[PDB]
Unconditional design. Structure first.
Lengths: 112, 229
RNA sequence: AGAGUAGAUAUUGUAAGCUAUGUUUGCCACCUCGAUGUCGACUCAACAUUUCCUCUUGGUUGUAAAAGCUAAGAAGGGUUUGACUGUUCGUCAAUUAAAAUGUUACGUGAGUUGGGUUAAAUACGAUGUGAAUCAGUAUGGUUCCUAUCUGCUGAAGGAAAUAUUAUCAAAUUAAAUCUCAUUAUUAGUACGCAAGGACCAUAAUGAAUCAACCCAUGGUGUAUCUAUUGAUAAUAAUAUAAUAUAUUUAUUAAUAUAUUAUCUAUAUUAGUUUAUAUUUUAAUUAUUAUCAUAGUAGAUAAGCUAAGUUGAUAAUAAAUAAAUAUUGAAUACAUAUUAAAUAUGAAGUUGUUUUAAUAAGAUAAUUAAUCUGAUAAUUUUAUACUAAAAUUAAUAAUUAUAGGUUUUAUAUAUUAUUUAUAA
RNA sequence: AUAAUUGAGGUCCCGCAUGAAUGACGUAAUGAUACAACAACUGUCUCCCCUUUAAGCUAAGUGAAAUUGAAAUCGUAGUGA
RNA sequence: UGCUGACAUGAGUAACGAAAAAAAGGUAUAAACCUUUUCACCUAAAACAUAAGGUUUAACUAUAAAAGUACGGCCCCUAAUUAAAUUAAAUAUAAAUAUAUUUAAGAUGGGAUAAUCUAUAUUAAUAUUUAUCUUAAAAUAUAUAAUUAUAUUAUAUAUUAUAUAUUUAUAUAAUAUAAACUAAUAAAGAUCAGGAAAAUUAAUGUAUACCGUAAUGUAGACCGACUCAGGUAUGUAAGUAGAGAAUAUGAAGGUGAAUUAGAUAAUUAAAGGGAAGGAACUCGGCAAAGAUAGCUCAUAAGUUAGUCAAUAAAGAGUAAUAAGAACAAAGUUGUACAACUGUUUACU
RNA sequence: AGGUAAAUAAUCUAAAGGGAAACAGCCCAGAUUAAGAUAUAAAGUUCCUAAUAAAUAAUAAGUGAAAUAAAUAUUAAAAU
RNA sequence: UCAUCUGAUUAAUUGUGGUUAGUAGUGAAAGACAAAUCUGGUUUGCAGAUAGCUGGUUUUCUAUGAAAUAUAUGUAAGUA
RNA sequence: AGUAUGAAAAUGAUUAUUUUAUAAGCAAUCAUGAAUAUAUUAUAUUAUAUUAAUGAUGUACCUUUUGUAUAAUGGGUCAGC
C-alpha cells in the first residue's frame, strides 16, 4: 500500500525513461500536402487548406445580420440618450480579452 | 449487442439520439466536423437512410415504399431547422445517389484537436453540388475543393499532376457528366485563385481544366511469373 | 509375562527398559511485546509421509475361497455431501475405493466473513456492605490501506547475434500429465461339506479431473422485430387563414406553388381549472419520436457461454524398491551374492505424452527501378496499452481490411382475400 | 419435529445457584427485539453464464496522499537479540 | 516521531465530487464562453415568488426609485425575557452582587382609513382543537288532494326590468356550470378548558420623513476547511391521471455543469435476464426473490369485546384470458421478553 | 531448558585481532603510529582457501571428513 | 448514498426569540449532551505544576578505568 | 513580512568524461588493469586527478540493552534553531 523507502534517483529514472513504451516517438509519418507544399500528417488533411476552404464557405454561405430599421436610422445624440455607456465588470473585461486565453492555429513548415 | 457498433460512452437511448442528430446535421450542412468515432458511426446511419430513401423512390411495391418511408421518418428528428428534412431527402439528397452503389459519405481525418487530443474528422456527403441555381457557392464537397486547390498549386509550380491527384479526379468524375464537372472546377478556381491571390486569366484556366479532364477520361519487374516444369 | 482352542513372537503385548519426535498440555521469558492476520468458516492451497484407498509382496494350526488380519515397498493419483453445534471436535444420516495423519505464524484477509472469545448499553444466577464482579448464561454491537520493494501471473520493449534477414526448426529445459470405479467374460471354473466364490487377465460402461469447441441445445442478446398502457412532441395529407412570389386574368377576384398559422378574447356572482355558448381561420386521417427501470411483455442473428459438444489419463520400452529365484564356494554342508556368474518384479523411477521457453541446425536473399523491418491508414483472428495477425488493389497484370452496397440466408409477423404483367 | 437436529416447542424436576411489587404465574394486542417451524419464492446455493452503465485501461489538461536511515533490494539450508 | 524553512519520494500516479449530448456560427481562435437549432433532465422542481445569511456575488459605477390601500421596516403596544435602572432605612449580602417592587427595554405576535380611493395630526369637552352531519327547507321527474327520485342549499356578480330619488342613488324581483380552493358568516363536539397589552364626538389640520428594494436563496452567491451528493424557512407550484401534493408525463420555464476523447481485459460497484433444481447457502433464507385490484363485498380462532385480531388469511364481483406503465400493497404460526403509543448511546 | 538459586574461574559486559563455516560470552591473543624481515599462538596445510610430506595400523560403511544418538540384534576379531 | 424498514394529530414536527453549564446545567437515564463528542467544556492564569518514567544532550587529543554485590529502604525501574 | 548581495545545501533537467545489458547484498575501503582529464622542469618508461574491468575483505548509524545487521528505537533530505 505504502512505499517502504525513499525511491532513489536511479530507480525512479530507469522506471520512467528506461522503457520505450513510456518514451515519445518521432513522428516519421509526416508528408507534403498537395494543395500547399507544407508538412501534414499521413492519411490526414492539411489543416491550412481545409481551414481556408471553411473560411471561403463562411464568406459565401453567410446568413445576413439582422439590423433593425429604427436603430439603424437613429441620430447619434438620440442613440447616446437612449443607450448610454457602462463600466464592464472585471470578469467581463477578462472575457473580452480573448487573445489572452484563446489559441489560434499555427502554420507548419514548408516541405523540401 | 457487443461488437455490432461503437458504444461511444453513452447509454443506448442517448447514443441513438446523438447519431440521429449527427445524421440530421450532415443532411442539413453537407459537411460536418466531429470526433472520429462519432463520425464513423454517423456515416453508417446516414448512408443507411440514403439507401432506404433510394429504395422508396425506386420500388414499384407500394407497401414496401410506405415501410421505407416510415423507417426514414423514424430515423430522423423532424423539427425546427429539420422540419422539411424528409422532403429534402426525397427531392434533393437521394436523387444524387441513384447510380452510386453505396459509399455516399466520406470520413476525412483531420489533425487531432489540441485541448483534448481527440482524433478529429470531417463527415461529409459525396458529390454535393458546389454551385446552386443562385449565383453563390455551396457549403460542402471539401475533397473536391482540396483537389482543385492542389491542381492550382501544381499549375503555379509548372509541375505535373501527382498520380494520386489524378486517381482522385477520376473517382470524382465516375458519377459526373464531364461538362458539368468542368464547369464546377472552373467555378472553384475563380474563388480559390482570388483567396490565394493568383491572377485569373480565364481562357487559359479553361484550357488547363480541359486538359486535366482529357487525361482523366481517356484511359491508356523483380520477380518473373513462370509455369511449373 | 499374559492372551491367542493346542502354541509367548498368525494375531495379541501389562509393569519396567531404551530411543525418536518437536504436532499437543505444559515448562522457560529469549524475541517485538504498534505479530489482529484476533481461535471458526470461506478462497486458496503447498508440503510431509508416520499409506486411508489404489499397485507390488512376505506371514497368517490363527491364508480353502471370499472377505480379512498383519508387515514390506510405495506419496503417482485420489481421499465427501448433508442434520445439529461459533465451533476445531463429535454424534448422526447417506454415501464412496478410500472418506489417512500432519506441517505450512494451531497454512490462509494490506484477499473475505465476523458467528464465537471480543470494549462502551443491558439483564439473569452467584459474589461483595457497596461501587462493581464472575472460566457463568444472554440480546446487541465499526474495521481501514490507491502496492514502493521482494515474490508470483501474464505482456511487451532493449539486448551481444559463435555476429544479417525471412523462415523451418532439433537436444534440452520449465511445466503439465499421470487415475479410478463398476458390470461382463474368463466362470459358477479354481476352491468347498456345503454356504459360497476367485487370482491372473481383458472388454464395456461409467466416475473424477483436465482440455478444446459453439454445428446443434439451453442461456443471455440496452442488435432487432412485434404487442401494449399513460402523457407529450412532431412530420405528412387535407381544411382553413394570412404574407410572398408566379400567374387566369382583370388594384382585385381567380390560378399555382412557397412559407406561416390552427391561437385568441368574454360570460356562467371571490380565485383556480375544466365544460359549454360566445369570439375567431383557429382542421380532422397516414406515419414517426421521446419518456415512463431497455416503460412492460413475446420472440430473438451474432458473440459468449454451459445445462451442451468433442478430446484426453500420454503407450512401448530401460533400470529398479519391496519381494521371489539359478549355479555357487569362502564355510564337506549350506547360502538367490553384505563373493564371481545368472533371473524375475511396482499406480513408483527413467522415459513417453502434452504445453510453454529457447534457437543448435537447416533452406533461402544479400545495397535494393519491388532489400528486411518500423512509423502512418483500414481492421481482427488478437488484445488493458501494447504484442500478433489480415489488408493498404486501382496495373496491360493478376489479391476485398473495414464501411457502404448488393445478393442469398436468419430474425420478426403478418401475408394467396396475395405479387406483378397483360389487354 | 429432521433422512439424520448441541437449535425449537412440549414435558419431567436430585431448582449447580427460581419465586412473589429487584413483584410470581398465564393470555389477548402490539414489536424494525431474539430463537425456531411452515408455505411461497428466489443467482443465496448445485455452478455459475450473459448483458447495461460507472470506473478500471489509452490519449490530452490540471494534479494529491500515507511513507521514506541509505539502498547496486533473488531462492533454499545454516545462522544469529 | 525535536522546531522553522526549502525541497524531495510515492507520481505525473489516484482523482477531477450523482449528470446528455450534437452541430453551425461567433471566431480561417473555443470539448469548457456567447448565439441559433436539435436532443435530453428537473417539473408539489434543478421552475416562479420569498425569509435568513453573505467577500456585490447582479442584467453594475451613467447601479438595486415607495404617503398608504395583497409594502415591509420605522412607529404604537405588549409575550417569553432582560436591565452599573428603579424604590436615616426597599430586603439580603466578605466585595462581587442577589431578591422583590416599580420603571424602561424586548417580535417570532397585536395594530386606523381606504379605488365610487384614503388621511394617521393638534386642541375643547365627555379566537385549543374540530366539524360543517343530520334534519328541515327550495328544486327537476314522477306524476301530473301523492309517494318516491336524486341532486340544491349561508354568503361574494353582472345583466334586465322595475321600484322608489331625480342620468347617478338605492331597493325590488328575473335568468345564470362541474370541480377545487379562499375570505367574512352562522350555528356546534370534545377535554387537554384554549396569550398579553394600546375613549368619544366635535372643531381645526395634513405642501406627505427616513429604511429595506439588485442578484442569490433545495445553493457555484449562506452553514459545513472545497464551486463539498451533507444542512438550510415560506407560498405558488401547466395541463392530462387519479383518492391523493402518491405515480407517469410535462405546456412554460430552467438547466446540460472546472475535465474531455477513446476503450469497454481482469476486476469492483449499480442494474436487467437465466435451463434443471429449489435454502442443498449460511452464524442466521443476510441479500435478492415473492403482490392473481388499490375499489366494492367477505372475512375465523382467540380476546381485556376494541372489525382488537384486521389492511386478517384465503375467497368474490368490476377488468382479464398468452402476455403487453409506473406507483401503494409482501404470508402464516410457536417461544422468550417487554403490556401498549413512545424514549435512548448526535458519529459502532 | 538459551531455566532458575548462589559458589568459583574466565571472557563479555567495556576488547578491536587469529581460530571455531557464519559466531557478545568458546579457543588463542590484548590496536600508541606505521611497517612487514624474523620467530611464532590458537587453528590449519587436495581445491574453494595462506600452507606438507612420511610411517604404521584399521575401516568399506562415504561409517567418517568441526554440532560423536540408545537398550538391544547380527556378523566378525582377539583372549581364556 | 442507495435499497429497505418505521412514526406520520401527536409523548407530533419545525421557524423566530428567551432561560438554565463548568462542582457544572440538561438528561422518558445512554456517563447522553452542554459548538465535530464530557466518569465533567473552553480559554487565560498558577506555570518552566510534577515526573524515581521516556527521549535528547553538539569539537578534538591525552592518561586511568568500573559495577550489576552486601546492607537498608511503602524498597525491589529509585536512593544512601 | 527591511535593502542588497548570494558558485550554501537539499532537489530538476542537460551535457561531457568514465563505467555499465552472465551478475545478486550498508554500495565502501584496499588491491589492480583500463579510459580520460590537466600539468610553464612529462627528461619519461612522468605525476596527479576522474572513473562500480577486476579480486579480496566488509552484517548502516543511534538509543536501550546480559546481548542488536537486527524483523527493538529515531530520523524523507538539506539549511537555520
Amino acid at each position: 500500500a505504502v512505499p517502504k523507502k525513499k525511491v532513489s534517483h536511479q530507480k525512479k529514472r530507469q522506471k520512467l525513461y528506461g522503457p520505450g513504451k513510456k518514451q515519445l516517438k518521432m513522428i516519421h509519418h509526416l508528408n507534403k500536402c498537395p494543395s500547399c507544399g507544407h508538412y501534414k500528417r499521413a492519411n490526414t488533411l492539411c489543416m491550412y487548406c481545409v481551414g481556408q476552404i471553411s473560411h471561403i464557405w463562411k464568406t459565401h454561405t453567410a446568413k445576413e445580420e439582422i439590423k433593425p430599421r429604427q436603430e439603424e436610422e437613429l441620430s447619434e445624440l438620440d442613440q447616446r440618450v437612449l443607450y448610454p455607456g457602462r463600466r464592464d465588470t472585471k470578469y467581463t473585461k477578462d472575457l473580452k480579452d480573448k487573445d489572452n486565453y484563446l489559441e489560434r492555429r499555427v502554420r507548419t513548415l514548408k516541405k523540401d | 449487442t457487443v461488437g455490432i457498433a461503437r458504444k461511444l460512452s453513452r447509454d443506448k437511448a442517448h447514443r441513438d439520439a446523438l447519431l440521429k442528430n449527427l445524421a440530421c446535421q450532415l443532411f442539413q450542412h453537407e459537411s460536418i466536423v466531429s470526433t472520429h468515432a462519432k463520425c464513423k458511426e454517423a456515416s453508417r446511419v446516414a448512408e443507411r437512410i440514403i439507401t432506404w430513401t433510394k429504395r422508396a423512390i425506386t420500388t414499384s411495391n407500394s407497401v414496401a415504399q410506405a415501410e421505407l418511408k416510415s423507417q426514414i421518418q423514424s430515423q430522423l428528428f423532424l423539427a425546427g431547422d429539420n422540419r422539411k428534412l424528409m422532403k429534402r431527402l426525397f427531392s434533393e439528397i437521394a436523387p444524387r445517389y441513384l447510380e452510386r452503389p453505396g459509399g455516399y459519405t466520406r470520413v476525412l481525418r483531420l489533425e487531432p484537436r489540441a485541448n483534448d487530443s481527440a482524433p478529429q474528422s470531417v463527415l461529409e456527403l459525396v458529390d454535393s453540388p458546389v454551385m446552386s441555381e443562385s449565383h453563390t457557392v455551396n457549403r460542402g464537397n471539401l475533397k473536391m475543393w482540396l483537389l482543385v486547390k492542389s491542381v492550382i498549386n501544381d499549375d503555379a509550380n509548372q509541375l505535373p499532376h501527382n498520380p494520386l491527384t489524378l486517381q482522385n479526379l477520376h473517382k470524382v468524375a465516375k458519377f459526373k457528366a464531364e461538362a458539368q464537372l468542368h464547369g464546377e472546377i472552373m467555378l472553384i478556381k475563380q474563388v480559390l485563385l482570388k483567396e490565394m491571390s493568383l491572377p485569373y486569366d480565364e481562357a487559359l484556366e479553361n484550357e488547363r481544366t480541359q486538359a486535366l479532364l482529357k487525361e482523366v477520361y481517356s484511359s491508356s519487374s523483380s520477380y518473373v511469373m513462370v509455369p511449373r516444369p
